[PDB]
RNA sequence: AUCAGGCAUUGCCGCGAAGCUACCAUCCGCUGGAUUAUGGCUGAACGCCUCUAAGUCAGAAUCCAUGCUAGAACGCGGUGAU
């Protein structure tokens, strides 16, 4: 159709700032500061109320208005990242060989050492992305909680940790062994 | 004659340094980036879902480099003495 005009509403919570110039969304909030440049999309933002910001696409398309709702999603994810933040719980699932996971330091860099995964002599090194914090949580045996602000920091840290412990040259339906993201949620309680 | 030699298409036999040479001998043959397949992240389209659409992570003996050989006899630079 080439949609003459379409827009998306982006709500702004009670104690956060949104700084947009030419396409650099810089959200500040109680947790801290998140930056993300959207110079790849070609949309227009407009502050109406200091609490709603309307993002818009003029003479849109099927592939174009899809991105307009995508950018609303990414910007809400940033506001969530500063207001409440993110917290991914992963469980160690092992059949025989218990997974030995701990956070070590190599030249002050924050790695996650994985040793004794299917009794593998290898020591798997998962570099913790800055802004992501690792907690080997008590009260749940064989759990690891990756918390912080930016969803793409938390999610890719959790994903890169899951991917390195993939069993090779086996029936992956019998050898159901590795560290899997059980829960994806927010840091703040009363929820 | 002796000694010492000639000729036998290098007279033949044993040893024979130097030279060349043999997986028949010895030494030596590097580690970064980007990717494919594939598995993923965030994530719309399609109130969910989704690795894909925007963006992105990981990644092969592949590709490009580090390296190695040559050096354009019409590519070039610095320098000496003239």
UniProtKB/Swiss-Prot annotation:
Keywords from the UniProt entry: Cytoplasm, Ribonucleoprotein, Ribosomal protein
Q: Could you give one GO CC term from the UniProt record?
A: cytosolic large ribosomal subunit
Q: Which InterPro entries match?
A: Ribosomal_uL6-like (IPR000702), Ribosomal_uL6-like_a/b-dom_sf (IPR036789), Ribosomal_uL6_a/b-dom (IPR020040), Ribosomal_uL6_CS2 (IPR002359)
- Subcellular location per the Swiss-Prot or TrEMBL entry: Cytoplasm
Say if the entry is tagged with keyword Ribosomal protein: yes
**Its Gene Ontology biological processes?**
cytoplasmic translation
Q: Which GO MF terms does the UniProt record name?
A: rRNA binding; structural constituent of ribosome
Q: State the family it belongs to.
A: Belongs to the universal ribosomal protein uL6 family.
Additional free-text comment from the UniProt record: Present with 76000 molecules/cell in log phase SD medium.
What is this protein for, i.e. what is its function?
Answer: Component of the ribosome, a large ribonucleoprotein complex responsible for the synthesis of proteins in the cell. The small ribosomal subunit (SSU) binds messenger RNAs (mRNAs) and translates the encoded message by selecting cognate aminoacyl-transfer RNA (tRNA) molecules. The large subunit (LSU) contains the ribosomal catalytic site termed the peptidyl transferase center (PTC), which catalyzes the formation of peptide bonds, thereby polymerizing the amino acids delivered by tRNAs into a polypeptide chain.
Please give the subunit comment from the record: Component of the large ribosomal subunit (LSU). Mature yeast ribosomes consist of a small (40S) and a large (60S) subunit. The 40S small subunit contains 1 molecule of ribosomal RNA (18S rRNA) and 33 different proteins (encoded by 57 genes). The large 60S subunit contains 3 rRNA molecules (25S, 5.8S and 5S rRNA) and 46 different proteins (encoded by 81 genes).
Which protein is depicted?
Large ribosomal subunit protein uL6B
């Amino acid at each position: 159709m080439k949609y003459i005009q379409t827009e998306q509403q982006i709500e702004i919570p009670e104690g956060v700032t949104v700084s947009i110039k030419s396409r650099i969304v810089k959200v500040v909030g109680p947790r801290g500061t998140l930056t993300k440049n959207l110079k790849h999309i070609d949309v227009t933002f407009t502050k109406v109320n200091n609490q709603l910001i309307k993002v818009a696409v003029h003479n849109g398309d099927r592939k174009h208005v899809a991105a307009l709702r995508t950018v609303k999603s990414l910007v809400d994810n940033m506001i969530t990242g500063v207001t409440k933040g993110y917290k991914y719980k992963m469980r160690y699932v092992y059949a025989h060989f218990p997974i030995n996971v701990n956070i070590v330091e190599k030249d002050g860099a924050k790695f996650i050492e994985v040793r004794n995964f299917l009794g593998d002599k290898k020591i798997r090194n998962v570099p913790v992305r800055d802004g992501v914090t690792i907690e080997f949580s008590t009260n749940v045996k064989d759990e690891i909680v990756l918390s912080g602000n930016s969803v793409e920091d938390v999610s890719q840290n959790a994903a890169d940790l899951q991917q390195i412990c993939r069993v090779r040259n086996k029936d992956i339906r019998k050898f159901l062994d590795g560290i899997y993201v059980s829960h994806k949620g927010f840091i703040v309680e009363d929820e």
